[PDB]
Symmetry: C2
Subunit: 126 residues, 2 copies
């Protein structure tokens, strides 16, 4: 039922606005039949807290981090504790140019912001 | 209009998806219709055959949803072949491959790994609205 869409460093900046996407994500979540706490931050500590909560709750996560994607063992460790599904999403294509991918259930890269809404659809059907 | 969905070596020997190929091939076509597309769902172990299908889609300017098998990691040919694609190419794997390096991913528009046979349908769904 409850899904956590967590976003990281250099995503508060982010062709969409803060909060086009949250609104895009939230209603689509609704249309699918879920609730998407959409959360953003620029610090790992804030980030890690939300991951532990999801693990403590067993509530699915949609994670995108920018700068802590390919640098953070801490973020990998917390994500290892996640009981319920973890879908890594990326808007840009990182492969032309990750820590979590061996701990993520699945990954989506390079499909814009619709990556988020596709991840949802998986979780819902699953 | 037309979406080419191609499958590489060993993918007809499913039985990964839980679901078999024949089942898979119908479902994709099934879910393609409701999105408003004609899923031309193919497979072969022949690398030559695959590459042809890549050329076909390149000449036609059609989007591809590619799931190579073991060629996805090993084959230069397949990247040159994919490097010809003008319209989108979505790379799809049923398992989560993170095999951690894939030739196609740096020239694929996007990738979907570890979401089962549903990656195909999520890939279709990006093409519909893009």
């Amino acid at each position: 039922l409850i899904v956590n869409v967590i976003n990281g460093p250099n995503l508060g900046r982010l062709g969409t606005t803060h909060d086009e996407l949250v609104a895009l994500i939230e209603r689509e979540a609704a249309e699918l039949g879920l609730k998407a706490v959409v959360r953003q931050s620029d610090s790992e500590a804030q980030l890690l807290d939300w991951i532990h909560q999801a693990a403590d709750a067993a509530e699915p996560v949609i994670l995108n981090a920018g700068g802590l994607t390919h640098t953070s063992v801490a973020l990998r460790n917390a994500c290892a504790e996640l009981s319920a599904p973890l879908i890594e999403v990326h808007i840009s294509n990182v492969h032309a140019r990750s820590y979590l991918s061996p701990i993520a259930t699945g990954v989506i890269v390079g499909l814009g912001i619709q990556g988020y809404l596709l991840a949802l659809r998986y979780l819902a059907e699953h």
